[PDB]
Amino acid sequence: XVVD
Amino acid sequence: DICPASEDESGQWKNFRLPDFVNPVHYDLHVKPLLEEDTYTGTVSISINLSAPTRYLWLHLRETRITRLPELKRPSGDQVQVRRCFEYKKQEYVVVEAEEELTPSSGDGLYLLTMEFAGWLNGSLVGFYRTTYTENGRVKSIAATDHEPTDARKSFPCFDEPNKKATYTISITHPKEYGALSNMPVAKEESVDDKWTRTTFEKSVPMSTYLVCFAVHQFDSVKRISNSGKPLTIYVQPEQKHTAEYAANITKSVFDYFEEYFAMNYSLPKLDKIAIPDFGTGAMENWGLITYRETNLLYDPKESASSNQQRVATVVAHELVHQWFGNIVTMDWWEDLWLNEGFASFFEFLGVNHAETDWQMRDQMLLEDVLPVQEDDSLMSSHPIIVTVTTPDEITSVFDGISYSKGSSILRMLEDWIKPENFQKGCQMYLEKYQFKNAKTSDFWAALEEASRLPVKEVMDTWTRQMGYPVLNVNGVKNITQKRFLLDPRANPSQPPSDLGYTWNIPVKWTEDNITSSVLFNRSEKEGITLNSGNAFLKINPDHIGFYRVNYEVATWDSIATALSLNHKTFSSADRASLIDDAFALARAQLLDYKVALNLTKYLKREENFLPWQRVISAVTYIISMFEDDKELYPMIEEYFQGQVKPIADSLGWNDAGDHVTKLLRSSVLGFACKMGDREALNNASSLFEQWLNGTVSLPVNLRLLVYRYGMQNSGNEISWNYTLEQYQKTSLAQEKEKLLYGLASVKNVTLLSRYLDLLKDTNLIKTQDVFTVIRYISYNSYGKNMAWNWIQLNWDYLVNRYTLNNRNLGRIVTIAEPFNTELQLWQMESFFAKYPQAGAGEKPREQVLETVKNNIEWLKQHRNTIREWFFNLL
Ligand SMILES: *[C@@H]1O[C@H](CO)[C@@H](O[C@@H]2O[C@H](CO)[C@@H](O[C@@H]3O[C@H](CO)[C@@H](O)[C@H](O)[C@H]3NC(C)=O)[C@H](O)[C@H]2NC(C)=O)[C@H](O)[C@H]1NC(C)=O
Ligand SMILES: *[C@@H]1O[C@H](CO)[C@@H](O[C@@H]2O[C@H](CO)[C@@H](O[C@@H]3O[C@H](CO)[C@@H](O)[C@H](O)[C@H]3NC(C)=O)[C@H](O)[C@H]2NC(C)=O)[C@H](O)[C@H]1NC(C)=O
Ligand SMILES: *[C@@H]1O[C@H](CO)[C@@H](O[C@@H]2O[C@H](CO)[C@@H](O)[C@H](O)[C@H]2NC(C)=O)[C@H](O)[C@H]1NC(C)=O
Ligand SMILES: *[C@@H]1O[C@H](CO)[C@@H](O[C@@H]2O[C@H](CO)[C@@H](O)[C@H](O)[C@H]2NC(C)=O)[C@H](O)[C@H]1NC(C)=O
Ligand SMILES: *[C@@H]1O[C@H](CO)[C@@H](O[C@@H]2O[C@H](CO)[C@@H](O)[C@H](O)[C@H]2NC(C)=O)[C@H](O)[C@H]1NC(C)=O
Ligand SMILES: *[C@@H]1O[C@H](CO)[C@@H](O)[C@H](O)[C@H]1NC(C)=O
Ligand SMILES: *[C@@H]1O[C@H](CO)[C@@H](O)[C@H](O)[C@H]1NC(C)=O
Ligand SMILES: *[C@@H]1O[C@H](CO)[C@@H](O)[C@H](O)[C@H]1NC(C)=O
Ligand SMILES: *[C@@H]1O[C@H](CO)[C@@H](O)[C@H](O)[C@H]1NC(C)=O
Ligand SMILES: [Zn+2]
């Protein structure tokens, strides 16, 4: 995962 | 219907975890999408290593249905007879029962299990799905997958645990106008009809299910070749082809840098990156086929900001780290998720620092991870780095600040303590040992212990198997003691129970007159230690390299304030930021009088560096928001901080001049000036905005966001709101789109914000990926703080139905309530939570926001007069  | 649901609990399938004795080796996977129908079908053949007599075989499946009664093969080759199949909802299992039961796979032979399945491509951003975009006025389609953590099971039936590694050969049957991508290169393409192509990909290395990825697209591409000779290509809409250039650059530079740094070959023959037009997370590290949200991948030097540039560089770097950390070596269980995300959050900075030399990335770790997570991990509702997770909702929740930022931060401490050289060599050995297998946290400590012979397990365990961190109390310049640091003074410092009792082994570093010393502070030194030159000052925790706060004696703190006033450059930029950050957190915690803290800000008219300003702004943002409605305190705080930024705001001016860090500083410094009500900065924003509305002028890239926000806030009306909405639709660049949404959220008009909230239900206007972003923006608006909060309440059933309780972003949306600071607001929150007590992935965020709001109420009671006095006496 970036989770934004 | 074909495997009906059954409530039959009497079997091993009632267990949340898959059994030990069933093991996949190879997946034969075929899917055929009906793109225009939003459906797909597929069959899967799995080779299974059975270890124990069992009359049932079971594996994960959600939403997607089995369409044909599945068929099982003995390792000999015979057809095993099947009595029944049935779905077990409660633990997301499809279960098949043999007439009989059979025995382990003793030789090299394996069972083969084959099942046909049908699912949907619509109404979701997980599993296998379709979305659209517009090219030359035509609506086009693209289908892709997204699995982490527990959504592989939606795409196809599988053994959906990260440690159930198996090998993949994927094939897809698709319309011939489309290409097909997966983890591996294409092996063979064969015509099915004159209309359909079957694309088959070559065998994969053993991997986790969450990493399996495929796509069907009509994208163009930008290409680069590694030092290894392997093609690195970024897939991108033809319209947006120019905006893939930067990411292409960074992928090459960072790929080449990492392969050398980890001393390990990238495991696959190619690597692809692609941004899905509607994508539920930021980015996903699928081996060889990394997926992105456009804001994290696509960058226009003529339109995008340096903030955007750095975000693109960092996410690409992050996702590349996973090719080694996460993909090659994966955690055994999600409890050890930090082994993936913490490591990615750490090395991302090393990656980008190679690619971009003057970005001062190593320092920026403080702004991005260390200091922000020190806020998080000072709450009672934090959790230890190694986290017990027992449901899919709990699993998906821990993709959070603790896994990423604290993970990053304790690795940063470790490297410094253990020395970079040995840290590097240790990582390599870990990577050699567990390659294509799984690791636990214990496995990583032991690896580094071989590289240092330092007591890594003993020391690092304390930072890892308990939540929280310590404050170091200074007595007499030189004596330190440790105590757990909690933001709430009333909280019980011993809860929740921890074997280690909230004492740590702290690697402590300090600076005696430009010279640097080191000591490990043992847990068992209950009465503290003494730091080994007749000294008058001791700089403890240089660059805030350790994951703790230092509380000096008040007199020391007083002398630091004076030292900053006289010559602030006495301290490094990081050291300044750190002392400031600590002081203000200590004050927040009622461990330091606020007068002492505020005294540290007096010097600021001469402050010129990025790091201190960022941490000052963070600290002031909190205090100012607590006093928003205080007609007495607010103007005085505004007036002061307006005066403190004014010189640097003026000095830098409204123009994109200077290096990276300078341009970031100007952004945040001009923004703060605007926030603090500086008439001249607001007039700059309004003037530029008015020019942008004339439709020609392209705004300076690092000022745009500020101009849209403060411009709309100060002179926005229906005409300019409508215009901005049209412009948002018209631009292809996601990075610009996002700025424009923030702009539209800034208007000081209830009717227009109400229209905007209504747009959230319209998927032709707001993409599904963007809904929570927009809600959060609106929540920042003086009117919308309450509008967004009310809207998510009224529309809670609708959001749950659209996203499901397993959606991370939905669980987190309650944090828009963070600025709440009254008993009334707290009661509203609690009443809403009690009405909708199924929180799913929102369970922790709810706990956290309640603790925050409770702290706010306390904070006001304790500090209003003190903070009043400091400002009244000063102004
Ligand atoms: C965008 O922001 C700028 C601030 O960064 C504004 O520029 C400032 O405008 C002020 C008014 O004209 C000037 O005030 C003068 O300051 C000087 C000090 O060097 C003194 O002589 C005077 O006290 C004062 N003028 C008078 C007549 O009393 C600022 O000097 C000036 N410049 C700077 C660099 O700060 C811009 O005006 C603003 N732009 C818009 C379009 O609003
Ligand atoms: C650390 O913070 C301390 C507490 O604020 C500072 O001490 C204070 O300095 C103030 C000046 O900034 C004094 O304010 C004055 O208060 C009296 C009434 O008590 C008024 O008559 C004056 O008008 C007012 N001054 C102004 C300019 O309006 C405080 O009296 C004083 N408080 C105490 C208890 O001494 C320290 O200076 C500060 N340490 C630093 C900067 O190193
Ligand atoms: C994708 O679209 C299909 C087709 O409309 C959805 O299935 C329908 O669901 C509604 C209730 O939600 C029923 O009234 C229909 O009878 C269903 N149609 C069929 C053919 O089964 C499906 O739910 C959508 N997928 C998602 C994830 O929302
Ligand atoms: C908020 O925006 C609305 C929408 O433009 C404004 O209402 C308009 O007011 C003008 C005259 O003031 C009318 O001619 C329009 O027909 C109105 N539109 C609607 C939809 O009612 C409103 O004035 C703005 N309010 C504030 C406080 O700024
Ligand atoms: C701003 O845009 C809104 C929405 O497009 C316009 O208001 C709508 O206009 C349509 C067609 O004229 C009506 O059917 C709707 O009832 C209107 N309101 C809403 C809430 O949709 C509005 O005319 C535009 N205003 C300006 C000044 O351009
Ligand atoms: C990519 O790098 C080349 C040189 O390697 C450079 O000329 C070009 O401007 C870069 N492209 C970007 C930053 O988009
Ligand atoms: C390891 O890297 C070198 C780089 O040139 C390459 O020649 C070699 O084939 C790689 N090893 C494997 C197993 O692919
Ligand atoms: C600090 O601790 C040591 C050891 O207990 C002691 O010698 C010293 O007096 C203490 N206090 C101060 C103020 O230095
Ligand atoms: C911590 O204390 C234990 C007590 O048994 C000791 O063996 C160990 O060496 C200590 N570690 C240090 C001081 O680094
Ligand atoms: Zn990641």
Q: What is the CATH number of the domain that holds B263?
A: 1.10.390.10
CA angle B5, B126, B197 (to 5 degrees): 95
Q: Which two tokens stand for residue B684?
A: 């700059």
Kindly report the nearest CA distance between residue A3 and chain B, in angstroms: 5
* Phi and psi at residue B48, to the nearest 5°: -120, 125
In three-state secondary structure terms, B318 is helix
Distance B638 CA to ligand 7 centre (A): 61
Give the residue numbers of B marked as catalytic.
Answer: 319
Minimal Cα distance from B314: which residue of A?
A: A2
Residue owning the nearest CA to atom 7 of ligand 3: B120
Q: Is B181 helix (H, G, I), strand (E, B) or coil?
A: strand
What gap in Å lies between CA B210 and CA B505, rounded to an integer? 36
Q: Is B296 on the interface with A (CB under 8 A)?
A: yes
| Chain B environment of A1 (Cβ under 8 Å) | 148-149, 281, 284-285, 340-341, 399
Same domain as B108, residue B233: no
Instruction: State the nearest Cα–Cα gap between B283 and chain A, in angstroms.
Output: 5
Index of the ligand 7 atom closest to the CA of residue B229: 5
Q: In CATH, what number is assigned to the domain containing residue B494? A: 2.60.40.1910
Burial class (CB in 10 A: 0-12, 13-18, 19+), B266: buried
In this structure, which residue's CA is closest to atom 2 in ligand 1?
A: B680
Domain end among B420, B450, B468: B468
Q: Quick one: B149 and B162 in the same domain?
A: yes
- The CATH code of the domain that includes B86 is 2.60.40.1730
To test the pocket of ligand 7, the residue of B258, B259, B265 to mutate (highest count of ligand atoms within 8 Å of its CB) is: B265
Q: Which ligand is nearest to the CA of B719?
A: 5
Answer yes or no: are the C-beta atoms of B473 and B481 closer than 8 Å: yes
The residue segments making up the domain with residue B149 are 1-219
Helix (H) or strand (E) run with residue B459 in it: helix B456-460
Confirm if B230 and B188 have CB atoms less than 8 A apart: no
Same domain, B262 and B374: yes
B173 neighbors B198 (Cβ within 8 angstroms): yes
Residues B439 and B512 in one domain: no
Resolution (Å) of this entry: 2.4
* Structural domain count of chain B: 4
Ion ligand 10 neighbours (CB, 5 A) are: A 1; B 341, 344
Interface probe with A: pick from B208, B281, B398, most Cβ of A within 10 Å = B281
The reply to whether B55 and B89 lie within a common domain is: yes
d(CA B144, CA B627): 47
Nearest atom in ligand 8 to the alpha carbon of residue B478 is 14
Q: CA-CA distance, B851 to B849, in Å (whole number)?
A: 5
**B206 with B294, same domain?**
no
Same domain, B343 and B319: yes
CB atoms within 10 A of CB B137: 5
CB atoms within 10 A of CB B657: 11
| B215 shares a domain with B235 | no
Q: Which residues 1-4 of A are in CB contact (within 8 Å) with B?
A: 1-4
Contact status of B318 with chain A (Cβ, < 8 Å): yes
Q: Is A3 close to B808, i.e. CB distance below 8 A?
A: yes
Nearest chain A residue to B317 by CA distance is: A2
Q: Residue B193's CB: how many other CB atoms inside 10 A? A: 9
Q: Which residue has the tokens 């199949």?
A: B85
Q: Which among B700, B658, B805 has a CA at the least distance from the CA of B358? A: B658
- Nearest partner of B86 among B111, B57, B51, judged by Cα: B57
CB B95 within 8 A of CB B86: yes
Is residue B753 located within the same domain as residue B798? yes
Angle between helices B784-794 and B771-780 (to 10 degrees): 140
User: Could you say which of B285, B296, B341 has the minimum Cβ distance to residue A4?
Assistant: B296
Geometric angle at alpha carbon B431, from B429 and B433, rounded to 5°: 70
Contact criterion met (CB below 8 Å) for B181 and B38 = no
Give the largest CA-CA distance in chain B: 90
Write out the E strands in B176-219. 179-182, 186-191, 196-201, 214-217
Which of B414, B446, B468 delimits the end of a domain?
B468
Could you tell me the CATH number of the domain that includes residue B836?
A: 1.25.50.20
The answer to whether the Cβ–Cβ distance between A2 and B319 falls below 8 Å is yes
Q: How far apart are CA B333 and CA B36, in angstroms?
A: 38
Locate the DSSP E strands across B418-461: 437-439
Residues B754 and B773 in one domain: yes
A4 chain-B contacts, CB cut-off 8 A: 281-283, 293, 295-296
Co-location of B512 and B579 in the same domain: no
Per the CB < 8 A criterion, the answer to whether B250 and B313 are in contact is yes
Task: Indicate the residue among B181, B197, B219 that finishes a domain.
Answer: B219
Structure tokens at B177: 């106008």
- Shared domain for B399 and B252, answered yes or no, is yes
B315 CB within 8 Å of a chain A CB: yes
Closest CA in chain B for residue A4 = B282
CB B636 within 8 A of CB B872: yes
